[PDB]
């Protein structure tokens, strides 16, 4: 009942994290400062991602190992999915934050992010061509959280993933297009999940290179967030 | 235009032949990495012929063909491994004369992680009871969906054709309309898991190159340089 399509979307809509306000530094972007304004923004969003995930129906009913498994495997993917939704209507730019809008070429000051920036902009453009809705994005983001763990309590997670899947089918069904067009959109939407995951792995492979070059302190930003923040 | 009933039949005849490695002496870190990279090299030769037999692939520009192959070749090798191993838990059937149990990875540093990813994704396909026709569509979809960025419009048509074929395959099973969307969604979500395995299994091959366990990293490029045209 709480997993009902119309209801689950409303729950997902009310679980959306608040906008994080980070601004540009006064000095021009250097490799150290840009890699710092991005990991600072990521740290703040990861605080809200825990509250968002805990607010998806059934997530708190999962085991503690499964919750950590899902978050550890999806946090970078969820950060990128939210970035592409904020940049969906601004071609050539990445809307990390309202007061932090980065043009593409601005990534020329840090080694190797332009490859990652082009991946994000390309996937964002494909979501623009598909005319991604707001409720498709809410389902897709929740699906990323529930599906990104590989597991290389199990019955409850499978039920939630199917529930969010029913919600995405229900949102597409509201478009009124043909049954064949409804399957095509569902397939075009989910085939992009591979491109988001690819960006998740590549943009994260780049973050490991920055820790080895002593540009950033640590690599696992979720682990860093949890270690530094305190429980109320 | 090919019907979905006719496209699936074309993918069937495009299936590569089986390859043997026959080897070796117990397994070392270098000997196992030698056998797996040597197996991939032999398979990559047949992957070129397989891709060119997918309807419309030869009509794509030469740039597009190389772009798709460079992006998906590890995924295609891994998807083919998963299909061969779908009915044998705990085992990876790389080639006929090379069936590895899960624990046999311990000899190569970091390979157990990749093996468990391949086995777990293989288990999801087994629990889904992946059909032959579904496998043929999915593997073709991996080639045509791997790229990120007149020939571009033709590629979107080919991916639509293979996707329609998959939807047709699911529809002909006679399951509920809600079950048809559920099955299509579960299949395509596993594409992300194939990509994660491809990215991590390739991150691992790069570490084996810096460790000087294997000579080359881009096995597709090494194949095209060494093999000659007829
Ligand atoms: C992970 C990186 C820093 C954090 C960046 C970020 C930071 C916040 C956010 O909401 C999204 C993204 C996506 C791109 C990420 C970058 C890609 C490479 C870089 O290391
Ligand atoms: C890419 C690796 C070598 C080649 C292996 C292979 C080789 C042939 C094949 O058909 C499939 C696979 C998947 C696993 C691959 C391995 C995973 C890690 C290792 O580097």
Author numbering:
A (entry chain B): 261 to 412, 422 to 501
B (entry chain A): 262 to 285, 287 to 411, 421 to 501
Give the exact sentences the study uses for this entry:
There are two subtypes of ER, ERα and ERβ, which are encoded by different genes in separate chromosomes. Allosteric modulation through LBD conformational dynamics is a crucial process for the ligand-dependent transcriptional regulation since this domain is responsible for the primary cascade of events, including hormone recognition, receptor dimerization and structural rearrangement of AF-2 that modulate corepressors and coactivators binding.
In this study, we present a new crystal structure of human ERβ LBD bound to E2, where the C-terminal H12 is packed towards the receptor in an alternative conformation that closely resembles that of ER (and other NRs) LBDs bound to antagonist ligands. The ERβ LBD-E2 crystallographic structure that we determined displays the classical three-layered α-helical sandwich fold, resembling the known ERs LBD structures, except for AF-2 region. However, H12 is oriented in opposite direction to the one usually seen in all active agonist-bound structures of ER LBDs. In addition to the hydrophobic contacts, the main molecular interaction that seems to be responsible for directing the alternative positioning of H12 is the polar interaction between D303 in H3 and H498 in H12. Thus, despite the different orientation, the alternative H12 conformation seals the highly hydrophobic LBP in a similar manner to the canonical conformation. The main crystallization condition difference, which led to the alternative and canonical ERβ LBD-E2 structures is that the alternative structure was obtained in the absence of the coactivator LXXLL peptide.
